[PDB]
Structure 1
Amino acid sequence: VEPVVVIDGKGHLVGRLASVVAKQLLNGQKIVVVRAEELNISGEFFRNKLKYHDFLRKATAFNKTRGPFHFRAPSRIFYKALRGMVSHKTARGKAALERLKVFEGIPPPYDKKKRVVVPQALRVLRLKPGRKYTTLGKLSTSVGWKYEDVVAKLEAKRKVSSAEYYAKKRAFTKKVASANATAAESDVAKQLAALGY
């Protein structure tokens, strides 16, 4: 449908977002995911902290380097959920994984690009209300991710700019609306109306 699809991860459930990203890649669709720190996991914060520490004790006994790597960042916690859904040791898998980018925050050019959502991974649509869940940023920070403040800062700044942008556009669509309605009731208008437009 589009050469590139930018997903705003905020309010999405990790495994369900991962599951749909993986498939799109293997079908040849490029994906970049933004705001990974705003991602969600079901279960209360403590369960998922505990689950991370579970993952944290696994290491190669003779050399901790060869052993499993533990990435603390939100985008990387995500990439793990995703990479496990791809057969990543095959040329085909490595090919699909190169179609992917994950980001905490919304860095340049993507900030001025439109982003979309995935209704089948959306927490508020998916989780039954009252169930407890977890924000990826807080989880990561508890396991050693260093950058939560820097990201939140830059975002608050980015969010101010985007607000002006929006305001100017909402104003412009107010003129366009007024003009469109002054053309209403003319011939060409009523004719389009007949044809469903």
Structure 2
Amino acid sequence: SSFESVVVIDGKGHLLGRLASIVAKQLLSGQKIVVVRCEALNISGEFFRAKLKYHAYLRKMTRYNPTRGGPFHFRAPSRIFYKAVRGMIPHKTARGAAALERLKVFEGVPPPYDKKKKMVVPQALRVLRLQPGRKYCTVGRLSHEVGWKYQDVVARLEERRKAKGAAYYERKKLAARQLSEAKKAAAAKVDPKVSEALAAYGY
């Protein structure tokens, strides 16, 4: 348990409903949540079950006027996760609306969240939850086959971001090597009594 300014969550490898429940509880408790890479979220079960559920969703519309009052079918993966979250919050109240304003959802990782720490939720992670052999699908693939138009643009932007992250990781590895060398070199120059005092304290 910890209180943060905002929690940025990598949405890759997470289950939709469990992540939505945990995020909704955090929002109602008062924690600001940003979720990135919503196109990489996971739904348990085979893909045609999710496709059938979204087509059954697409069936429903206000009969006398589809421009007002009807279920507006948002095809984007971030919007699908937002719908899952909003179904778990009393959104028609002022408190629920205020809890919804504490949430941001995106496809990919737009800046400046690409240079921020992304956390994971182990209670929603698919490798930690699903039984081996059970099938699962991708919310981004579902979105692409129900009409989302920006799978390729997000993929190209993610490749560019990953190349820049690879360069940053090369610099980070160089810095880590230099830090280890610095500690090894300075270990001879620290006062010995300081050294065994810190060692006995556990540092």
Task: Assess same fold via TM > 0.5.
Answer: yes
How many residues of Structure 1 are paired with residues of Structure 2 in the alignment?
197
**Aligned equivalents of 2:161, 2:46: Cα separation in 1:** 30
Amino acid at match of 1:90: T
Q: Look up the match of 1:90.
A: 93
Amino acid at match of 1:194: A
Say if 2:44 is the partner of 1:42: yes
Structure 1: which 5+ residue stretches go unaligned?
none
Q: Cα offset for 1:88?
A: 0.3
Q: Look up the match of 2:166.
A: 163
Q: Cα offset for 1:64?
A: 1.1
Match of 1:137 among 121, 136, 140: 140
SS at match of 1:114: coil
- Pairwise mapping of residues 147-162 of structure 1 onto structure 2 (< 5 A)? 147-162=150-165
Match of 1:79 among 79, 82, 100: 82
Write out the 4+ residue segments of structure 1 that deviate beyond 2 Å after TM superposition: 181-186
Q: Is the CA contact 1:184–1:190 (under 8 Å) kept in the aligned structure 2?
A: no
Structure 2: which 5+ residue stretches go unaligned?
none
Q: Cα offset for 1:121?
A: 0.3
Q: Cα offset for 1:178?
A: 1.4
Match of 1:8 among 7, 10, 31: 10
TM-score, normalization by structure 1: 0.97
Q: Look up the match of 1:195.
A: 201
Q: Is the CA contact 1:43–1:131 (under 8 Å) kept in the aligned structure 2?
A: yes
TM-score, normalization by structure 2: 0.95
**Aligned equivalents of 1:189, 1:138: Cα separation in 2:** 56
Match of 1:99 among 75, 98, 102: 102
Identity %: 71
